[PDB]
Each structure stands twice: as C-alpha cells, then as structure tokens.
Amino acid sequence: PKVGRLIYTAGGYFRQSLSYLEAYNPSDGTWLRLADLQVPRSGLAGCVVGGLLYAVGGRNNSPDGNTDSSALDCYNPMTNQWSPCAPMSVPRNRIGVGVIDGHIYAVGGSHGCIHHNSVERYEPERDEWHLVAPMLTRRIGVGVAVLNRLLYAVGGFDGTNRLNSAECYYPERNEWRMITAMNTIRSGAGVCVLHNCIYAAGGYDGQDQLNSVERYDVETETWTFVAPMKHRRSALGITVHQGRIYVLGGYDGHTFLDSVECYDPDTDTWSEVTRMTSGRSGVGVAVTMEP
Ligand SMILES: Cc1ccc([C@@H](NC(=O)[C@@H](F)c2ccc(Cl)cc2)[C@@H](C)C(=O)O)cc1OCC(C)(C)C#N
Incomplete structure (x- = not known):
C-alpha cells in the first residue's frame, strides 16, 4: 500500500458512450473530474503500468455512428493529458485486460458480430502489440484478472x-487451460484478485443481472459464494484497493447505477461508500497515484 492512490473511472455508457475520466479518493470521499478521453468509449478496460493509466478498446456509440475501438490511450496523472499509443491488431469492444510483468494483455471482445477468442500483448517501452495464444473459448463481456503472474478469463x-466457464493463461507455455467453471453463468461480471482468489461479482446470466459474488481459490480450484452485493449489477467497474473490492456503477435492468459498494473480506460484508457523479455502466477502472 502507498498514500495518494485514487480509483480512476474512464469512459462508460448512459444513452451513448462517454468520455469521462473521474477519480475517487477513498481517504476523503471526493471525486476529481480529469481530462476527457479523446474519443468517447463504452465497453473498454482500464489498467495501470508504471504509474500510467491505459484505456483499452471499447466502442464509440455516438449520434453519428457505432465504431468498435482498437485504440490504446495512456493518461499521465503528472500532466493530466491523454496520449495515443500503438493500436491493437483488431477492434475489441466489451474487452477484458490484465497486466503481467509490465505488459498489457487484451482479451477477447467483439468487432461487429465477430466474437474474439484472440489475445494480444502490449509492450509499453517498445510501444508494440503482438498476438499470443488465443483462448479456448470466444468471449465478449469477459472479466480478466491476474494473480501470481497467471492471467484468468472469466465468463x-x-x-x-x-x-x-473460465480459463487461465500460463505465459511460459503460451497456453490457455480451462479451470473449474463458476457456479453461475456471468457475462459482464466485475473480475478482480483479492488475496489468493479470483472474484467474479455481478454480471448477467441472460435473464437477470446478478448481485451474487463468487471467488475461485487458485490452490483448491473451487468457486465459493461470498456475501452478495446490495445492488444487482452487470457491466460494472471493479478494482481492489487496500485489501477491499470496489464495484462501481453498472446496469440492473432499470437504472444505470451511480452506486459504489466496497467489500471487506475479513467481515464478508459490503458497504455503500460513495456515488459516482452520474449513473453509468461499461466503464474501465484502475488505481494509480493522484494527479
Ligand atoms: C461492458 C459489457 C459487458 C457485458 C455485457 C453483456 N450484457 C450485459 O451484461 C447486460 F446485463 C447489459 C445490458 C444493457 C446494459 Cl446498458 C448493460 C448491460 C453482453 C456481452 C451480453 O451478455 O449480452 C454488456 C456490456 O456492455 C453493454 C453496454 C456497452 C451497453 C454497456 N454498458
């Protein structure tokens, strides 16, 4: 842990794709409004490498069109500016991303009616993307997380x-293997890593948005439900900060939620902690130092 670290939410969807970049400070309850993305995007992912925030993929649903994104953009909190990076090989909407040893893995997503099992890896210093082994399953709305330098694609x-279903990527073998399947079908779940488990919160089972939350223990290979979130949500943002899971926004079939809930694994409870400045879903979230 270190002082100064904010939860950053980029993009999202409410009626159309959004360009917002807003940062929450758990220490004081405040929200900062920062530089807008150059292009509005929903269905993107966020991540951090080297103190810099990356916005990856997504789609621009605007009045004039509906364009899947291959973009990679980098925000520097020290400048409050976005800079384009090399694009991915293919547009990827409803994408999932994970960082291993300073490299960004872009996983799955859609391009029109195409559902991708393809995965590619970004090298920041070289500013290059290269394809890696594809997943055994085509997955859009996939949740991705990294634990112990292994990459998981969930639901x-x-x-x-x-x-x-879920699968894991072993980088030294450039291979994907299926892991135990979740107890619940989930598209658009928030997926993150806390302790020695991969959590899958919320999502959509094709009928209902979910409030259930389950975790995969990488040693025992089981999925176990934990306490459910207060609010059902799908296409939520998620991150971990100071040993707690934060879920941001999402859609529950009636409202684009502004609710942010925080899970304490020691008490197995969720608490409501703040509200976003407006309700939205399909955002990309990550943590880095304050600007
Ligand atoms: C990011 C994301 C991930 C997963 C999904 C999945 N649908 C949902 O999860 C619905 F529960 C839902 C229905 C309506 C909404 Cl508005 C949100 C979610 C989608 C693959 C599916 O299984 O069909 C949609 C997503 O983004 C939709 C968008 C861009 C409109 C937003 N946000």
Whole structure:
C-alpha cells in the first residue's frame, strides 16, 4: 500500500458512450473530474503500468455512428493529458485486460458480430502489440484478472450463450487451460484478485443481472459464494484497493447505477461508500497515484 492512490473511472455508457475520466479518493470521499478521453468509449478496460493509466478498446456509440475501438490511450496523472499509443491488431469492444510483468494483455471482445477468442500483448517501452495464444473459448463481456503472474478469463458471452466457464493463461507455455467453471453463468461480471482468489461479482446470466459474488481459490480450484452485493449489477467497474473490492456503477435492468459498494473480506460484508457523479455502466477502472 502507498498514500495518494485514487480509483480512476474512464469512459462508460448512459444513452451513448462517454468520455469521462473521474477519480475517487477513498481517504476523503471526493471525486476529481480529469481530462476527457479523446474519443468517447463504452465497453473498454482500464489498467495501470508504471504509474500510467491505459484505456483499452471499447466502442464509440455516438449520434453519428457505432465504431468498435482498437485504440490504446495512456493518461499521465503528472500532466493530466491523454496520449495515443500503438493500436491493437483488431477492434475489441466489451474487452477484458490484465497486466503481467509490465505488459498489457487484451482479451477477447467483439468487432461487429465477430466474437474474439484472440489475445494480444502490449509492450509499453517498445510501444508494440503482438498476438499470443488465443483462448479456448470466444468471449465478449469477459472479466480478466491476474494473480501470481497467471492471467484468468472469466465468463462472458460467445454470441449464443452466456458462460459460467473460465480459463487461465500460463505465459511460459503460451497456453490457455480451462479451470473449474463458476457456479453461475456471468457475462459482464466485475473480475478482480483479492488475496489468493479470483472474484467474479455481478454480471448477467441472460435473464437477470446478478448481485451474487463468487471467488475461485487458485490452490483448491473451487468457486465459493461470498456475501452478495446490495445492488444487482452487470457491466460494472471493479478494482481492489487496500485489501477491499470496489464495484462501481453498472446496469440492473432499470437504472444505470451511480452506486459504489466496497467489500471487506475479513467481515464478508459490503458497504455503500460513495456515488459516482452520474449513473453509468461499461466503464474501465484502475488505481494509480493522484494527479
Ligand atoms: C461492458 C459489457 C459487458 C457485458 C455485457 C453483456 N450484457 C450485459 O451484461 C447486460 F446485463 C447489459 C445490458 C444493457 C446494459 Cl446498458 C448493460 C448491460 C453482453 C456481452 C451480453 O451478455 O449480452 C454488456 C456490456 O456492455 C453493454 C453496454 C456497452 C451497453 C454497456 N454498458
């Protein structure tokens, strides 16, 4: 842990794709409004490498069109500016991303009616992307997280069925292997890592948005439900900060939520902690130092 670290929410969707970049400070309850993305995007992912925030993929649903994004953009909190980076090989909307040893893995997502099982890896110093082994399953709305330098792709939608399946990427073998399937089918879940487990919170089972939350213990290979969130949500933002899980916004079939809930694993409870400045879903979230 270190002092100064904010939860950054980029992009999102409410009626159309959004360009907002806003940062929450758990220490004081405040929100900062920062530089807008150069292009509005929903269905993107956020991550951090080297103190810099990256916005990856997504789609621009605007009045004039609906364009899937191959973009990678980098925000520097020291300048409050976005800078374009090299684009991915293919547009990826409803993407999932994970960082291993300073490299960004872009996983799955859609391009029109195409559902991608393809995965590619970004090298920041070289500003280059290269394809890695594809997943065993095509997954859009996929949740991705990294634990112990292994990358997990959880749930999603293959174009016909929402999935309870999950798989793991072993970088030294450039190989994907299926792990135990979740107890619940989830597309658009928030996926993150806390302690020695991969959590999957919320999402959509094709009928309902979910409030259940389950975690995969990488040693025992089981999925166990924990306490459910107060509010059902899908297409939520998620991150971990100071040993707690934060879920931001999402859609529950009636409202684009502004609710932010925080999970304490020691008490197995969720608390409501703040509200976003407006309700939105399909955002990209990550933590880095304050600007
Ligand atoms: C980021 C994201 C991930 C997963 C999904 C999945 N749908 C949901 O999760 C619905 F529960 C839902 C329905 C309506 C909304 Cl508005 C949100 C979610 C989608 C793959 C599926 O299984 O069909 C949508 C997503 O983004 C939709 C968008 C851009 C409109 C937003 N946000």
